[PDB]
Amino acid sequence: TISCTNEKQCYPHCKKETGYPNAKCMNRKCKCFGR
């Protein structure tokens, strides 16, 4: 998926995607816990 390192990297990723700021960054990939 995207390319990040720290979990704070997917903060704006999931926030603007689903609307939840809770996101994680593992293996350069971002996940949204606010599905």
mmCIF file of C-alpha atoms in Angstrom:
data_model
loop_
_atom_site.group_PDB
_atom_site.id
_atom_site.type_symbol
_atom_site.label_atom_id
_atom_site.label_comp_id
_atom_site.label_asym_id
_atom_site.label_seq_id
_atom_site.Cartn_x
_atom_site.Cartn_y
_atom_site.Cartn_z
ATOM 1 C CA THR A 1 0.000 0.000 0.000
ATOM 2 C CA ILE A 2 1.296 3.518 0.735
ATOM 3 C CA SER A 3 4.838 3.952 2.100
ATOM 4 C CA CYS A 4 5.142 4.990 5.768
ATOM 5 C CA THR A 5 7.136 3.924 8.852
ATOM 6 C CA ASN A 6 5.622 5.233 12.115
ATOM 7 C CA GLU A 7 1.923 4.736 12.942
ATOM 8 C CA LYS A 8 1.434 8.526 13.112
ATOM 9 C CA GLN A 9 2.025 8.476 9.333
ATOM 10 C CA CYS A 10 -1.455 7.014 8.702
ATOM 11 C CA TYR A 11 -3.085 9.587 11.005
ATOM 12 C CA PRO A 12 -4.156 11.865 8.124
ATOM 13 C CA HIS A 13 -4.430 8.865 5.773
ATOM 14 C CA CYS A 14 -7.357 7.139 7.507
ATOM 15 C CA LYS A 15 -8.682 10.425 8.925
ATOM 16 C CA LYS A 16 -9.332 11.769 5.402
ATOM 17 C CA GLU A 17 -10.297 8.330 4.033
ATOM 18 C CA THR A 18 -12.902 7.020 6.511
ATOM 19 C CA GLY A 19 -12.870 9.964 8.947
ATOM 20 C CA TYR A 20 -11.053 8.217 11.822
ATOM 21 C CA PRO A 21 -7.598 9.401 12.928
ATOM 22 C CA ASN A 22 -6.839 5.972 14.442
ATOM 23 C CA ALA A 23 -4.494 4.394 11.869
ATOM 24 C CA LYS A 24 -1.410 2.135 11.976
ATOM 25 C CA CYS A 25 1.723 1.905 9.794
ATOM 26 C CA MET A 26 3.260 -1.579 9.471
ATOM 27 C CA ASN A 27 5.381 -2.844 6.552
ATOM 28 C CA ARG A 28 5.063 0.534 4.794
ATOM 29 C CA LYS A 29 1.277 -0.045 4.783
ATOM 30 C CA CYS A 30 -1.471 1.960 6.529
ATOM 31 C CA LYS A 31 -4.624 0.556 8.174
ATOM 32 C CA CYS A 32 -7.838 2.253 9.356
ATOM 33 C CA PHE A 33 -9.350 1.229 12.713
ATOM 34 C CA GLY A 34 -12.383 3.461 12.042
ATOM 35 C CA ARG A 35 -13.940 1.394 9.228
#
